[PDB]
Design a protein around this ligand. Structure first.
Ligand SMILES: CC(=O)N[C@@H](C)C(=S)N1C[C@H](O)C[C@H]1C(=S)NCc1ccc(-c2scnc2C)cc1
Lengths: 104, 87, 141
C-alpha cells in the first residue's frame, strides 16, 4: 500500500510516495537523490519526534488511509552542517485573506 | 523519475515529479527545471501540487474516487490559478 | 437521436450510489426527453425495474454536476444472465481542478452576487454557465 508525503525543511517541500513497509532510512535515500545530502547528514521527524532508521513508515504512523494523495502526511527534515545538527524548522505557508462579504 | 521545482510568490520551493507537473499545459510550456510563479502564493500552490498527486492516482482507476477537498478560504485564489494553469 | 428503444423485454437493475452526492437518475424517454426519478442518498442503493435498450444517466440532485455510471456517461440495461440483476455503480469522476473550484464557489455564493466577485469576466461566464442536462445531450450528438 502506498502512502503520500510532504517532506519539509525551511521553505522546501518534497511531494513523494513510499510503501507502508519501507523504512525511514530508505526515505532518506529518496531525499539524497533530490537534495544531494547523504542519510548520515539527515534527521527525519514526525512532529517533534526523531525517527529511527530501521523502523517502517507504518510503525511511525504513516498509513495508507491517513497519508492520502489529496491530503498527504508531513515529515520534518533537518540537515547537519559540519559537526552538529540544526534545530527543526518548518516555515508555515501564507495566510489566506478574509472571506469576501458575498461568500459569508 | 525526474523532479522539477515550482516556486511560489512568497518563496516556498515545491519539488514534484516532472510527470505530475506536466498535468498543466501551461507548466509544460514554461519548461519546454525551475519555474517561478509571481502571482500564486504558497497556500494555493501547495493545494495545486496535491491535486496533481490526486489526479495521477485516481485517473484510469476502478477503485472508488473520493472528493477533492477545498476550504472556502482558498476557493477564489485557487480558481484563478487553475484557470491560468489549465488543469 | 439519443432515445430509449421500445423493446418491452424486462431488465432488473440495481442503482448503487458510491459517491458522496445525492443522486438524481434521469431516463431518456421515447421522444428523447429527460425524465427525472426519485433521488438516492449517498451510499444507498435501490432495486428497480427497467427494460433492455433504455438509456439512463446520473447527476448530483442539487447542482446537476455530472456523474459516471460503470466508468462512463450512459447506462443501458443488458440481458440478465441466470436471472441476476445488472449492477449500475454510480461514482464521482476525476473533475478538473477548475470545475471543482467552480462547484465550491457556486455552493458558497448566490447567483446574483457572481458579478461582484473580483475576477476576470470569463470566470463570471464560467460560473453562470452551470451544469445542465439538456446542454450535455447536445454535446453527446
Ligand atoms: C412501457 C414502458 O417502458 N414504460 C416506461 C415509462 C417504464 S415502465 N419505465 C421507464 C424506465 O425503463 C423505468 C421504468 C419505470 S418507470 N420503472 C419504475 C420505476 C420506479 C421508480 C424507480 C426509482 S429510480 C430511483 N428510485 C426509484 C424508486 C425506478 C423505476
Amino acid at each position: 500500500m502506498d502512502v503520500f508525503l510532504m517532506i519539509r525543511r525551511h521553505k522546501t517541500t518534497i511531494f513523494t510516495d513510499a510503501k507502508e513497509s519501507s523504512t525511514v532510512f530508505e526515505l532518506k535515500r529518496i531525499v539524497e537523490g533530490i537534495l544531494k545530502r547523504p542519510p548520515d547528514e539527515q534527521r527525519l521527524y514526525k512532529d517533534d519526534q526523531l525517527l529511527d532508521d530501521g523502523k517502517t513508515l507504518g510503525e511511525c504512523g504513516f498509513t495508507s488511509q491517513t497519508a492520502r494523495p489529496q491530503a498527504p502526511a508531513t515529515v520534518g527534515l533537518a540537515f547537519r552542517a559540519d559537526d552538529t545538527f540544526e534545530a527543526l524548522c518548518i516555515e508555515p505557508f501564507s495566510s489566506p485573506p478574509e472571506l469576501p462579504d458575498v461568500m459569508k | 523519475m525526474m523532479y522539477v521545482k515550482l516556486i511560489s510568490s512568497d518563496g516556498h520551493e515545491f519539488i514534484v515529479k516532472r510527470e505530475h507537473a506536466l498535468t498543466s499545459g501551461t507548466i509544460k510550456a514554461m519548461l519546454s527545471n525551475e519555474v517561478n510563479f509571481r502571482e500564486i502564493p504558497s497556500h494555493v500552490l501547495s493545494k495545486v501540487c496535491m491535486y496533481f498527486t490526486y489526479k495521477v492516482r485516481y485517473t484510469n482507476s476502478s477503485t472508488e474516487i473520493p472528493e477533492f477537498p477545498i476550504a472556502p478560504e482558498i476557493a477564489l485564489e485557487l480558481l484563478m490559478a487553475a484557470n491560468f494553469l489549465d488543469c | 437521436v439519443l432515445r430509449s428503444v421500445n423493446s418491452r423485454e424486462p431488465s432488473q437493475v440495481i442503482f448503487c450510489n458510491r459517491s458522496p452526492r445525492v443522486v438524481l437518475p434521469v431516463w431518456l424517454n421515447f421522444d428523447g426527453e429527460p425524465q427525472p426519478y426519485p433521488t438516492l442518498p449517498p451510499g444507498t442503493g435501490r432495486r428497480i425495474h427497467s427494460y433492455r435498450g433504455h438509456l439512463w444517466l446520473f447527476r448530483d440532485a442539487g447542482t446537476h454536476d455530472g456523474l459516471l455510471v460503470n466508468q462512463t456517461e450512459l447506462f443501458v440495461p443488458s440481458l440478465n444472465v441466470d436471472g441476476q440483476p445488472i449492477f449500475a455503480n454510480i461514482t464521482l469522476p476525476v473533475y478538473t481542478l477548475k470545475e471543482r473550484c467552480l462547484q465550491v464557489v457556486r455552493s458558497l455564493v448566490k447567483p446574483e452576487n457572481y458579478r461582484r466577485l473580483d475576477i476576470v469576466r470569463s470566470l463570471y461566464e464560467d460560473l453562470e454557465d452551470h451544469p445542465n442536462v439538456q446542454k450535455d445531450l447536445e454535446r453527446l450528438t
